[model samples]
Target: HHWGYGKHNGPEHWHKDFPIAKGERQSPVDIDTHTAKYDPSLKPLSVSYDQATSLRILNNGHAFNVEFDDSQDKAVLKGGPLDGTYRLIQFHFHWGSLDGQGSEHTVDKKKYAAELHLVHWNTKYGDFGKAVQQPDGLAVLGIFLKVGSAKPGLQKVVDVLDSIKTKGKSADFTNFDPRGLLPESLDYWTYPGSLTTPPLLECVTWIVLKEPISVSSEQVLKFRKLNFNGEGEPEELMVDNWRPAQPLKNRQIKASFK
Candidate 1:
C-alpha cells in the first residue's frame, strides 16, 4: 500500500514523505481534560445539514465516506470555535480490529471503540481544496462510538455498508441527515490540529463531542469487513485505519462547557 495504516506505510513512516506529519499542529492528540481550559467565549455548535445533501457512500481504501453537496451552505457547521460558517463536505470513520480501541483522540487517555469525523471547510477559503492550506480552513466534528444498545441514527449509515464492501466501490446514499448522528449534549473540546491521515495538513479546527453515541458491537464488525483491496486485488480487512495520537506541542485545548 502507498500510504496506509499498515506497519510499513503507517504514521511512523509517513513523515518521510509528508514532513508536516511532525509539524507543530498535528492532530488526534490525547485530550488531557486535567489541563483543558474552559472557554466561556466559545459558542454552541450549530449543525444544520440538509438531509438531501447526502449524495453517495464510497470506500476510499482508507475509510468509507458519505460525501455531501457543498456547492451551497445547506449542510453547515457554525459558531463553536469557528469564525465563519463551514460547509459540510463528507463524513468518515476510523476503527480497530477488535473491540475497545479504535478512536483516534483519547479523552483522559481513554480510547473509544471507534470515532466518526464530519469534515467541513470554511466558506471564507472558497472551497475545500484551497481550505487545506489555510490555518483556519477546516473544522472537523469528532464523536466517539461506544458498544451499547443500537443507535438508530448510526444504523442508517451501517445499512449502506454492504453495497460498498471494497475500495473504490460506491453507492448512491441520499436523504441522510448527519445532524442526527451527533450526541445531544453539544458539549465538546476544541483544538487546533491537522488531518490525521497522510498529507496531514495542519489546517483543521477539531471539535470533539464530550458525550459518545452507542451502537451494537456487530455494527463495528460490519465495518471491519470492508476491504483495503478492491475487486480482483488481494483482499485485506480495512481495520485500524486510524493514526496514533500525536504530541500536543505549545497548543492549548479548550472546552465549550465548564
Candidate 2:
C-alpha cells in the first residue's frame, strides 16, 4: 500500500511518495576511503549487547529484521562519533541477486556481497519513535559482508531464513549475540544521513565499518529466496534490496582509523 522494491514502486519512485528521498542528507553514499579524513579524536566504539535482549527474526516484506528489546538499557552502543549511549532496537540487511553488488554503502564505488545494519535509537531522546524526528535520533552500524568462507555467527541467522521466507512470517530467536556478526576492527566512516527506506527521515548517524565479514556464496543466495509478497500472494523474489548511492552534497566523511 505504501512502497517497495518493485519495478513500479522501487527506490527510483520513492521520491513520489516521500519527497525527502531526494533530500541533501540522503544515505547510502559512496565513501571514498582514500579521501576520507582520519579523525583521531573519535573514540573507539563501545558495544555491550545482552544475550537476553535478542528477541525474534521477522520477514518485514522488505528485509528480514532481527528485533531487540530496547525497553531497558540491556544492549547499548556508545562512543565512535556518537555523543551518548544508544539502545539497540533492531538489525536488518540489504543484498543483491548476484555475487558482486549487494551492499548499500559502497567504498570507492566498490560494492560488497551484502550489507548489515544494526539500528539503535539515542537514549537521550527516550523512545525510538521520538528519536527518529530528532537530528541525532538514531545511530546505525553498517557492516559489509563479502563472499568467502562460511561464518558460524551468520550461519545461525541463515538457519532461520527458511522459516520466514514469506513476508509477515516471524520466529522466536533468543540467546544469540548480535555482536557475533561484527568484524574485529571497529574502525569506521561516520556521517550524517537519512534512512535508505521510505519516510527517508534525516536522522541517522551512520557508522560504516571498514572491514567486512565473510559469507559463502550459498548463504548469500538464501537471502534472495525471501519473498516480497506475503503468504498466498504471487511470489516476488527479494533480491537487490538496496538503495543506490546518492549525492554527497558537500557532506564530509570522517574515518576513525588512519
Per-residue lDDT of model 1, residues 46-154, tens digit only: 8887543899999999999999999987888999999999999999999989777899999989999899999999999898999999999999999999988888888
lDDT of each: 0.91, 0.92
lDDT of 1: 0.91
Stretches > 4 Å off in candidate 1: 50-52
Stretches of candidate 2 exceeding 4 Å from the true structure: 50-52
List the candidates' TM-scores in order. 0.98, 0.97
| Top-lDDT structure, candidate number | 2
Candidate 2's TM-score reads 0.97
